[PDB]
Amino acid sequence: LTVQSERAFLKQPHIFLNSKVKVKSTRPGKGGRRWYKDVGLGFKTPKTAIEGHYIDKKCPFTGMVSIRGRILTGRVVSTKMHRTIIIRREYLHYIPKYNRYEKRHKNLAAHVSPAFRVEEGDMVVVGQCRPLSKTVRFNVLRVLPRTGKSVKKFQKF
Amino acid sequence: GISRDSRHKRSHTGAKRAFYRKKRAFELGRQPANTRIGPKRIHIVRTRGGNHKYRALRLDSGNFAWGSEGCTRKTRIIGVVYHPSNNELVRTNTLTKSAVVQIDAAPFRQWYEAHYGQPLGRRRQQKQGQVVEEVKKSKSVEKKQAARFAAHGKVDPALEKQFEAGRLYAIISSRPGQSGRADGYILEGEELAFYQRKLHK
Amino acid sequence: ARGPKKHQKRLSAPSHWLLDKLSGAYAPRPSTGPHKLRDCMPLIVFVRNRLKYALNYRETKAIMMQRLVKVDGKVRTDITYPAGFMDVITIEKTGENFRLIYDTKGRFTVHRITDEEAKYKLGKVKRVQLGRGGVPFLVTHDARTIRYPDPLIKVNDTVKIDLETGKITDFIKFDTGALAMITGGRNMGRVGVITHRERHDGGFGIVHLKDALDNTFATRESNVFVIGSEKPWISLPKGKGVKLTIAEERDQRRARAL
Amino acid sequence: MKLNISHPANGSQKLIEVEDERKLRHFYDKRMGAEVAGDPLGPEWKGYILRITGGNDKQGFPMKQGVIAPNRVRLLLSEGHSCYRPRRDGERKRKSVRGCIVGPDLSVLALSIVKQGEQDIPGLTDVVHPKRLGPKRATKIRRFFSLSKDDDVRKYVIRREVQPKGEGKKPYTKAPRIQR
RNA sequence: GUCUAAGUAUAAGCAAUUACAGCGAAACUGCGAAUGGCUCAUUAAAUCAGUUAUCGUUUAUUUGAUAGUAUGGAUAACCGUGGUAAUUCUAGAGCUAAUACAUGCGUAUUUAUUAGGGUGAUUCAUAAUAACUUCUCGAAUCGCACGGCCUUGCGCCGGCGAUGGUUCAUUCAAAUUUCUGCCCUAUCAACUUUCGACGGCUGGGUAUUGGCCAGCCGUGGUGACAACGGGUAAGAGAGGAGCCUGAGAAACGGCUACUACAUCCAAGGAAGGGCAGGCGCCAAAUUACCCAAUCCCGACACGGGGA
């Protein structure tokens, strides 16, 4: 009645478990599960992704969306969306006319898991997943919570 | 004749992009099967790799799952109750996935009375006919089905009110226009108060 | 483009075949079979160019159609289907065979070889995974599926099959500190000896190699091919596959010239 | 009109010139499958009844079945139909085919002999024509020549022969085959 | 277009010494042609180039692994009657067979439940259960040898291939997909939100991922680190509109209407939709010979090739 609702009414893992807990295998055993998964790739599962009773299917610890190879980092432009961050990855471009570098800033967008604890201005590890929309091809994995500022703040990272 | 691709759009910056090619036959989107209840009307639409796709336009029946026992009985469909997408699809009673359909509790209830030995879905007049309810107990069948009669013959009482209605709240998890059938499982408990609460809404 | 063609271009014809720049437009394209484009070597290129045992395709089809030539005991009356890798090719009269190996430069060479040394085959494991019946079977790198192996025999082992049923009579273990052919990278087709393996979570964990004369190169596990422990199964290629310099090896060739 | 009156049992059929549009009045307006006798055609015919099947218009158009409103409707034809050989496979060409109801426009009818009459006709029933190709598989030979199952067909031969002239040596003896 | 001894041959066709059987046009059956190469308004990181990846998708074909299970109706060719001016126009009556369309006293699909070697990790692979589909498969085929046991049983067992077949590979592919690089410019600092502009839930179809699309709301997405506009100095096909085949095509030198012309006619009806050559906007480069090489495709040593 709190997180099951969310204005559009189905919040289930792909393995239904909830109503048939009364079946006499898992309950005299212990198979009463929120869907438990590791992402792998040198990470650790956060505790709200261990037992946190929110349900989303684009979650990398609850759903089936996975990560492969390529790993990314970056700082969030606008945290405030419906669970999607936007990354401004800057880099130093080598202008051959000037024989120099310059700033060139880019914008990603990553689907957010309700597991971790969010900041705006933090340095966020994201990962390549299957394209779950146009711009959201990534997923939020691990936060380095830093006090970096807004648009004025710069670092190639 | 109907398109699917990602290029007939506007950009993430917003400017519409000049299309650089014409439509090629791998970017097709086909017509949805607004599946209705009745006779068996079938398109078989042969798709990529020689793999013919079961297109169910009109259907009658299909087996459902009794989730708290793993029992599967073939069941005739009655009607759509709720869909979180479209009250036009409820308003035409169009079948789809995530559609809760009230169903026939006759094959389920006759596995219940063919197996357990307990009444549900009956009036307090308690009428009864021929004997298969008792047909012959043994000492082994007496201890067996009486030992199963002792505790686990048990129901959510709102589901019991839908045995008295004889028409339960199942959910469709298959899609008809790509599998040729409209099947699902039975909704129990917190989801029963959830979607019966959507009948309340 | 937009579906398969069977026409091969001539300026883009790759290194292993030694095709002429002359004689019209098109080159002998190989069609489908066991291997990819790169390590392929058709009988067209084999018996006409590498052996000079042919004049034209009246003669080559007139050899192939009369059931004298065998590939793993199969008749193989086809021109576009490939010959495999580390190959065993038959001239059964007078008892001789043709193993295809690398040279010391990294391209394929013919060898007349005996019936036993030809009759076993060195074929790499591509995969050991679970199929029907609940058994982990072995997908070879080259042709076949070795069903019911020893259950601890895993990937990257290079197997002495006896070629007759596709059954493991021996395996060479994927190891650090072992001798391996390399087929890819900047230094493809070289006999060497691996000094280390690195893990590389993120794609294609590698090996460091340091040869007989202290030259180091680190190449990936998809192109490494552990060819022998010591145990000289196959014929030795020329110069032990060390691939020294052109000047010093040139002076060694002038020193060993008769 | 001129009639292709067809006889299945003797393999024999004819065309017949039809004078007396009065003899065509009973043949008018009748849809296909209906049965009109030969006694209203001829005084020399009595007892035959005949089934109407087909024929062709003036200027060569054929006849479809079930196509009431009798004019030449340019009917769309698909695979596996009458009055149609496919230009290519799968091809559905709109041709022009006459309706069922017989008006006076028809050139040659095609009729089916149903009931035999009393008058002999030489070229229709009296002359004889057995079929050319005979029973080819084994169980078809069983069903015609009554060989209940322990009989070994091989001695039952439905042969054809060809003798030439100019040679000169022998007759030519040919048996079809026995499958199964 | 296409015939292997290995599909179906009773050609009243050759050519020999009664199941057919050698040669073998006809016809059925299969494969076939996403291309040889054309014409002209263009395509300004959307292509493409590296570079990732499908744990988001299909693959005729290749080769390998492969499956303890619950004596049958036609028709074409053929024989005849033929219709009209007739053009792949075709009719009726009768034949007659296939590896051709079709029958036959565990597995394939979908739904849920449960158990569960690899990988960095999946609900992965894999197994069982309950059913389900208007049920796909587990051969009523062809040729080539002619044999072990000797119940000489019109026996039982017997190999060598050709074709055909559920499932996983493998190649050939096709499809998206990621970090960066477009040529110039501020007489370009505002642009996208129409009826998606970005999320996210539910579906739907797509071979699958995706606002690709519909409810349903939230508030967006980008840009003076140079968005967006402008400047071209680089894919589109008698014509719109729909449709069918296949592994792969919105196939057009394939159907169905409508639109613009135009050919045969017995004036009712029908068939119709190319580049090259010469003259041109007083004349000047062959209307050449071949698939012999190299290479490509088909029942396939023959048959076909504007490279």
Side-chain angles (χ1 to χ4, degrees), chain D:
Chain D
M1 294 179 184
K2 291 187 284 185
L3 300 172
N4 194 359
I5 296 173
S6 69
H7 193 277
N10 205 3
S12 177
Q13 69 179 359
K14 287 291 184 71
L15 293 183
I16 286 170
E17 181 179 1
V18 180
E19 198 264 331
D20 286 330
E21 64 182 1
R22 293 180 181 178
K23 291 172 189 293
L24 289 173
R25 299 292 177 88
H26 293 169
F27 293 164
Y28 290 160
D29 193 73
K30 297 297 289 183
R31 293 177 179 90
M32 295 177 184
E35 293 175 353
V36 181
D39 198 6
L41 189 147
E44 65 181 359
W45 290 356
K46 187 175 180 182
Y48 293 97
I49 76 168
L50 286 77
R51 184 178 183 271
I52 178 167
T53 302
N56 288 315
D57 292 341
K58 291 176 70 69
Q59 293 88 19
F61 293 93
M63 297 185 191
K64 202 183 178 182
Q65 188 176 1
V67 281
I68 305 101
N71 54 0
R72 186 181 61 245
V73 177
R74 190 177 296 112
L75 288 165
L76 182 140
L77 294 174
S78 67
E79 294 286 326
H81 292 288
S82 63
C83 306
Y84 183 80
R85 184 169 66 84
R87 300 286 172 93
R88 295 176 65 88
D89 198 1
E91 180 166 351
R92 184 179 63 250
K93 185 177 179 180
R94 186 181 295 273
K95 291 179 67 65
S96 295
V97 181
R98 180 63 176 84
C100 283
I101 295 173
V102 170
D105 57 351
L106 302 177
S107 66
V108 162
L109 287 173
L111 296 173
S112 298
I113 287 174
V114 174
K115 288 183 184 178
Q116 293 180 354
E118 68 180 5
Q119 183 67 256
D120 293 331
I121 303 297
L124 184 65
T125 62
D126 187 74
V127 74
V128 67
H129 185 200
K131 64 188 182 296
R132 182 176 177 182
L133 279 74
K136 185 164 184 286
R137 74 184 72 187
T139 181
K140 182 66 173 63
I141 300 170
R142 302 286 178 92
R143 287 182 180 89
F144 184 74
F145 293 103
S146 71
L147 272 76
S148 63
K149 68 179 179 66
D150 294 331
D151 288 334
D152 198 6
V153 179
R154 190 180 296 269
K155 63 179 75 173
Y156 294 83
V157 187
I158 56 166
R159 60 182 301 277
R160 72 180 65 186
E161 70 273 14
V162 41
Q163 66 277 16
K165 64 181 181 292
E167 69 275 10
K169 295 179 176 65
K170 64 183 182 293
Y172 293 163
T173 68
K174 289 179 180 179
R177 69 99 166 261
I178 289 92
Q179 201 180 0
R180 300 185 73 90

Side-chain angles (χ1 to χ4, degrees), chain B residues 25-197:
Chain B
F26 59 90
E27 290 175 350
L28 59 92
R30 289 189 180 93
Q31 185 69 249
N34 290 316
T35 300
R36 193 178 292 274
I37 296 97
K40 300 292 178 68
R41 182 178 291 173
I42 295 168
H43 289 173
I44 45 171
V45 178
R46 184 179 181 273
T47 61
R48 296 289 298 272
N51 294 114
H52 57 88
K53 184 170 285 188
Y54 290 161
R55 182 65 60 86
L57 293 176
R58 292 175 185 268
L59 293 172
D60 195 5
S61 179
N63 53 356
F64 292 146
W66 184 255
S68 293
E69 293 296 321
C71 180
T72 299
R73 296 295 182 186
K74 190 176 180 181
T75 303
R76 184 180 179 271
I77 301 168
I78 299 297
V80 182
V81 177
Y82 181 76
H83 187 197
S85 298
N86 202 359
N87 295 113
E88 298 176 354
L89 295 176
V90 179
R91 192 176 67 189
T92 62
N93 297 116
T94 301
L95 296 170
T96 181
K97 189 177 177 181
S98 177
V100 43
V101 175
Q102 57 185 358
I103 63 170
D104 285 329
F108 290 168
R109 190 180 65 192
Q110 287 179 358
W111 181 66
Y112 185 83
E113 292 178 352
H115 180 76
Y116 290 98
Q118 185 173 2
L120 290 180
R122 299 292 184 182
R123 187 177 288 173
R124 74 274 187 193
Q125 187 65 41
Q126 61 183 358
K127 62 180 73 175
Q128 188 178 2
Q130 70 271 17
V131 46
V132 71
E133 184 73 20
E134 193 269 330
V135 50
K136 187 177 179 181
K137 67 177 179 64
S138 301
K139 291 188 284 185
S140 178
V141 183
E142 191 269 331
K143 187 177 179 181
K144 180 176 72 176
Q145 296 299 110
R148 297 296 298 164
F149 179 74
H152 196 272
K154 185 180 184 294
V155 67
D156 193 357
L159 287 175
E160 193 271 329
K161 300 296 184 291
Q162 298 299 321
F163 284 111
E164 297 292 329
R167 192 177 60 191
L168 297 173
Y169 290 102
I171 189 74
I172 296 172
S173 67
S174 176
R175 62 185 70 187
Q178 297 181 3
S179 65
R181 64 186 68 185
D183 290 336
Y185 62 94
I186 191 64
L187 290 174
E188 296 175 353
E190 194 272 334
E191 290 175 349
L192 184 70
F194 187 75
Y195 292 108
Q196 285 178 355
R197 188 175 63 88

